[PDB]
Symmetry: D2
Subunit: 293 residues, 4 copies
């Protein structure tokens, strides 16, 4: 099983990708055992990025690692196909697209044709990014099988039955959960890993949760998993998407600039308050020799 970071995109004060902070972040993440980096995801504000900006992200992260899943999707199929084609000259794990989001009641036939279209032009494996909270509609194990060309799936449904059905109908598919809270469980139930936003700021915890469970130390796995759950809960208070920047600086030492409005940075009051709820958790994580002071 793997831990995959949907990598944050650091921005400058004038709203440009801070390529160097992104490179520092990716290097740290690989160093602490993250297997692969999911680029231009929700957590990286992928939807807020121009195609050119999606390309810089890949190019900047690619300076650090070839263990990239390159998310190219959007509401303009022509931009996504072109980004897919640009990836030919990169040694990467795959590209990815979500279903067209926002738009309700698109025909399944059009959904299937959309994805088969990406597969037809793609020079790399194609991963389904099934994010129904964001998109509204679901691409379940049956539609995935109907499309027939997915190498893997990121399932942001928390109902793990839904996720397992992908293995059941697509025994050859790689199947990841998008939940930081199911690292222990996913590993123990034979699934392929998690695409965990929280591995941005606690890669060590997420990798260790996975290793404990696979070492069949399920009880220790859960005790650490439940601590991780508490950090995840804290981050939602002010907007997980903003708070993820604060928690990376706090747990990992380097800052990631600003987010992209309308994802506003936490003001100084909010930053203080957030750390208060994780102070104890940091301490404990040092206490177990999982983090270095």
């Amino acid at each position: 099983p793997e831990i995959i970071t949907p990598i944050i995109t650091p921005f400058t004060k004038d709203n440009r990708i801070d390529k160097e902070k992104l490179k520092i972040h990716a290097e740290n993440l690989i160093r602490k055992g993250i297997d692969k980096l999911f680029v231009n995801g929700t957590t990286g504000l992928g939807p807020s990025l121009s195609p050119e900006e999606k390309l810089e992200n890949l190019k900047a992260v690619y300076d650090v690692t070839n263990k990239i899943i390159f998310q190219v999707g959007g509401l303009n199929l022509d931009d996504a196909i072109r980004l897919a084609k640009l990836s030919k000259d990169f040694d990467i794990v795959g590209i990815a697209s979500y279903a067209p989001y926002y738009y309700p009641r698109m025909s399944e036939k059009h959904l299937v044709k959309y994805f088969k279209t990406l597969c037809e032009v793609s020079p790399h494996p194609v991963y389904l990014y099934n994010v129904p909270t964001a998109t509204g509609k679901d691409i379940d194990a049956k539609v995935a099988k109907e499309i027939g060309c997915f190498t893997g799936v990121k399932d942001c449904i928390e109902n793990i039955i839904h996720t397992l059905d992908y293995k059941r109908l697509n025994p050859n598919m790689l199947v990841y959960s998008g939940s930081d809270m199911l690292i222990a469980t996913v590993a123990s139930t034979g699934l392929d890993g998690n695409v965990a936003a929280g591995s941005n700021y606690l890669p060590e915890v997420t990798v260790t949760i996975k290793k404990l469970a696979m070492e069949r130390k399920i009880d220790e796995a859960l005790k650490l998993q439940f601590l991780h759950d508490e950090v995840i809960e804290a981050s939602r208070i002010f907007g997980s998407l903003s708070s993820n920047y604060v928690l990376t600086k706090y747990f990992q030492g380097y800052d990631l600039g600003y987010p992209r409005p309308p994802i506003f940075p936490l003001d100084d009051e909010e930053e203080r308050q957030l750390i208060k709820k994780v102070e104890g958790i940091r301490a404990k994580l040092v206490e177990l020799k999982i983090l270095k002071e």
Copy 2:
């Protein structure tokens, strides 16, 4: 009360905005009794448009009428501010924004700052585009009051209690429904109207329902509303976003070019079957002297 058309955006075969077919459509819509034009909405693939295209749409439509609501939102607040300011030199009803879509668990604090910022730079009245199905997030009557600068709301919730709450908590506020099926009901219950996608292809029906209800001939209004309902339902069989092109052509004579993939145009057999579903209705609407042959 009014009928407002979220105007379709017609595309060329090479996927650019067809300004000539937009202008034709906008002229027709205004002639047939449509009160205002909602530009860059869902139905027009607003979110599939670049900031520049969103402005193209404003400019093209503005050659025909100034009775325009200009949607400018997106996942880059800087882009929306730029379109908002640029609008100052157009004499329009107002600007509009959906909530930042896709992103779940944005702070309520941060959502308010998004809209209040938008109000601070806007040269026109600012309208709330409340689309919980696309965004997952709800901007209800309470939150709309906290923001406190909305001249009006378009509520894409079909539960009209929720729609009425806007008028209860913001009595000076204009409150429209986004539902084609609540035209009769909206006009008679003291709300300000409907932003009806179906007025793209049957503005005669939607204006007539509206007038009958104003005239308190509710029985007749409902008779027509229910035929329109049957048309709305037909459009969903093959994808409503693509069917809206086919239905504008059939009922109104002129064609609207192409949608923007991944909203793919219906194929000949899908188009065939769609007409079969509304053939009888076109007749009864002609017979009723609402539509000319």
Copy 3:
């Protein structure tokens, strides 16, 4: 259009139906213009009643009025059929049943057969009590038409599109909303009325909201409707089902005993707090000569 009270069942301290308080309540309600009384509903704790207790309720209320809808449904079809048969010797408007509740994924075919079964043995008109929040599954306008024997429906869906579809597919069916908040709207849009729990304690308001709208005073209708909405909201704070007893004593003068555990009575702190939020509203209602001091 009508206002129908889903009548509260008053209980004694030792958990028996207080027949006399129920008779006092029903007499008051009829006196203040409630058209019909829906007996053994949610608000009357119908599900908490034995078949014998359902029968006493009918018999006690029948001493006051023949304008009764007698709800007989439950999870034992044999009890409900027998109660249906007992109604033969009563001049009443109808019986009613909800879909079997609690139980998820019952076949539609079994649902249709359940309702057609009640119609086959029923000596009175049968009303569909469509309460999906309570039951989970929905009996929409299409299933209603398939069953084909319903004289009316109580639709506790707040999505008024859902309700209107019953008229559209069953033009001859009586169609009521279960919402206190849509009295104004239901009347103005040509529907048949509301089954409004809040008419238990403010019958005068609910009847007046309806009359104003039908007098085409829609703006006054809404101003009173929005006041009524505020009383409805208050009642949910502690449990609408408990609070309804307090508000009847407070607005109408007589008490209704206790509810049935696990619907516990409001303690003295909760009773004080609830009245505080309606004090002003009572005052105002006197100010308009709608209530008598």
Copy 4:
């Protein structure tokens, strides 16, 4: 971890509890490796049973084993207290209650008093039967801690994050899933087991999956889980509550009489088609030497 059967209640042709067929079934279930028996649940039409019948069920099953959880909840707290006390003379695992079903918007305060009262009079451990689909109301990990007297929880939510939260906030608490499809997953992630309706008709499968997962042969566990999943899905085609009777007969040899209308028994053609859906699976399960011919 354990498999717990929410035992079917067999009925006669005249709609009384068939004590002889219940005892046969209960004996078989215990012989085939079932750990405990959950009595008067959904699957047994608990809610269709009078308090007296709920006790009949206790007594009948208690002739076979004392490894019983006795469901006593209902919409009359007095009835549940009476069954709770009466249980004192049986040496059973514990009693159980769903939340008062049907009633929405009961105060959280009042829900806690319901369960805490139940604990105050109970002579046995009290189990939480959390069924949000039937009740609409959720008793989550947080609320279960506030009540604070639950020895265990059966969670009928399919989102296992929510299930794990019970163990995180109540580490001494036994936490079971109500899902047949999460047997493999539940046993391997450190939870205490599954209350699986499907163990009525395939206890060999559910016990075998459980053991394979204990033995960390997760790959094999999942292979069998997915066949069981296909069986679960088949049972839903015609109504799972009625199909559970047909499937107990087919796989286990003995029949269970009749369900209680309005859970109607499948007709010959529905039964015909159901077997066709599980014919192949019966074979593969025999072939696999999990089921005898």
